């Protein structure tokens, strides 16, 4: 049973006008198996529109090229992405009710990425917990991971979590 080809993929930007199908290819297979590579070109004069994308055979693959970022292809740092673009390093998880502390949170989502800010919310009157908080990553891909799975479990709540501003 394969992942849905729409979360193997990664969207590059920035590439080099020289890079090819195949120099992209060859690059890009370092981290997985790749069912398709393209770059798109313009459709009359072929100059590349400098960006590709890439499939791999599974999301871990995925996983293993945004891991081995900052990617230079052909001598360009190109910028990979998943397909959620609403690029941010910041999630609002809410559903957490009043028990839920910061290191239930960030023992979870640590997981995703690299923690720089957890913020439990609390009301300004009374100061008691508003029952959600907003976690900010130095990274987005942390967040696209987040956002694309169906459920997130934290401290026995199922959350809802979108990405914040
Ligand atoms: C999630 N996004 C935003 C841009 C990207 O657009 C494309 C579409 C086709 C080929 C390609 F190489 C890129 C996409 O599907």
New binding site residues.
Partial sequence: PKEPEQLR?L???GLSFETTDESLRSHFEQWGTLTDC???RDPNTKRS?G???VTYATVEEVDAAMNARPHKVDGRVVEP?R???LTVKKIFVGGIKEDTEEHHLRDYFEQYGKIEVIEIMTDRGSGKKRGFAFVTFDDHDSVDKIVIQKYHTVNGHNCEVRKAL
Avoid: T
């Fill in positions: 993929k969207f590059i930007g393209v770059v798109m529109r960006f590709g994308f992405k397909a959620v673009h």
